[PDB]
Chaperone protein DnaK (Escherichia coli), 601 residues
Amino acid sequence: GKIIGIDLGTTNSCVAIMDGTTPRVLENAEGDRTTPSIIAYTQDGCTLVGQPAKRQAVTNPQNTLFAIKRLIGRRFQDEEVQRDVSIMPFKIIAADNGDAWVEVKGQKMAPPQISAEVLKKMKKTAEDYLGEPVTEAVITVPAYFNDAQRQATKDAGRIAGLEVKRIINEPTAAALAYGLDKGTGNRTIAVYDLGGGAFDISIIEIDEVDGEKTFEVLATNGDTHLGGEDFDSRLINYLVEEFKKDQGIDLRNDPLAMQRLKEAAEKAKIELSSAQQTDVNLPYITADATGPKHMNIKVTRAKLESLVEDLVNRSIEPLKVALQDAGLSVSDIDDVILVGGQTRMPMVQKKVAEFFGKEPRKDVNPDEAVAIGAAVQGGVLTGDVKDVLLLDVTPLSLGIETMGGVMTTLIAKNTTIPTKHSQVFSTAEDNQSAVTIHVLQGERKRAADNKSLGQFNLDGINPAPRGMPQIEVTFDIDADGILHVSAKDKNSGKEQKITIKASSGLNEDEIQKMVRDAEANAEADRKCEELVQTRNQGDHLLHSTRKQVEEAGDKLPADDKTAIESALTALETALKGEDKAAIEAKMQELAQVSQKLMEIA
Ligand SMILES: Nc1ncnc2c1ncn2[C@@H]1O[C@H](COP(=O)(O)OP(=O)(O)OP(=O)(O)O)[C@@H](O)[C@H]1O
Ligand SMILES: [Mg+2]
């Protein structure tokens, strides 16, 4: 059917469709144009995504997962993951291959599955709105996502039952959303996307020659682990230090208190984007030997700015790096476009404006432009948006490890994608059977300081002295920015088989198994919905039977009254439980014992 565009954000996700030439953002089941990227697994087998998961996060700290986008595609021993391990209320564990997974109720779960739950909620929103199945989608990633993160997001899309037609960089989607109506003036733009967990900057030229829009990404940079979560962490650290000073209690040891404190810190941070001062005001935070406790702390805007200024400057540096890569200057920027809720902070806007010497645009919605651009990209793929060309780039230099552990670059950063690079490898010693190519991404001169894409073993090499075979290895980077390594015999042209070791991601068996698990999870969700409907029916029956008993009054026989009231109590007790069959049996018994009373009514 239609290709929906899904913004899979760290904090909030957003689904859009291409209604003709007009992109439209679809409200979810709860009536919100954005959905929190929160996933909760209850004890009863039900899965909550969005606001329903958000509401119960306090009572389910170890089984409510959020900010999974900051774990997806990452190794367990990574510094960012290691820091996040002691912060997140849910358990972060190491997969068998060393990837960072989560543990929920004793179950190891890859971040692609958890993100696929959010993608499934977006899919269900699109299908409820359109009244037809959806099987194709465009999914967004941060522009600076590496190969592992992009492939992991694509795998998450596949596990959700979606054919991922395109993985598009979020600043590119913002530029697509901006360029649909407005100029069309051969502009040059700087997209500054600061979300909940990731930050990107993209310098993109949009020139329209003879009604043919061309979006060419001149440069891109950023930090995939810098976002609103870090601002919240700074505010939480200040709050806990002040509360420990003025109350003598370390609040980090109480999971419920930490959950409510994180929520209040985010609330106060959002409030300080409009107010000059606010109050972190939470009663019943924790308890000590004396009894209940309360928190009321004044926070000015200046204090938050002091706490987050260094993060803002960390976001400023990639602007300079990207401008240098694009070979331009600050004055060359025709427009500056802010994307992301965290750019709503006055300090962020002031810093960006004073860096660029220019006011950022104010007609770009920072919460929905990315999904709209994804929908526009989908329409371009289908053909419903004609005369649009896209020349995106890869954000990281692709290289191989050579003698001394030194990186040799084959595809430099900011190279336009899709792209190819072929290189011939050969033997270096007598009677070799396999040659290993250590493929990595990064800019540092040392291989150990970069991101390892893995060891590609060309094994099964015919016996020969050193230097005899000529094996042409081709490195492809597709429109999604994902690497594909192929091999061929230079002399004959026959393909050479490659084995990938010491890599990251999911194999085909895991992906298919997780698709089956997602289908079973959908079955369980349907059963949970049916149980809720049954409980609603039971409540209706209770109310109707009580009304009829009350309106019959003294006309009702005493034995029938006692039996009906006992049945009412039993049905109420069953309704408070979590057993559908018991509820249905109690409803049947109540209907049987009160049949004549309801027939009279
Ligand atoms: N008015 C505001 N003032 C300050 N911060 C805000 C405001 N509105 C939203 N935020 C913050 O912005 C972040 C949400 O932005 P957004 O929804 O765009 O992130 P996201 O798309 O999920 O993240 P990302 O794109 O990095 O993956 C949260 O950290 C939130 O607390
Ligand atoms: Mg975002």
User: Anything to note?
Assistant: The first strand starts at residue 3 and ends at 8. The pocket of adenosine-5'-triphosphate (ligand 1) is lined by residues 9-12, 69, 195-198, 227-228, 266, 269-270, 273, 340-342, 344-345, 367 (CB under 6 Å). The CA atoms of residues 280 and 297 lie 5 Å apart. Residues 394-509 form a domain with the Substrate Binding Domain Of DNAk; Chain A, domain 1 fold (CATH 2.60.34.10).
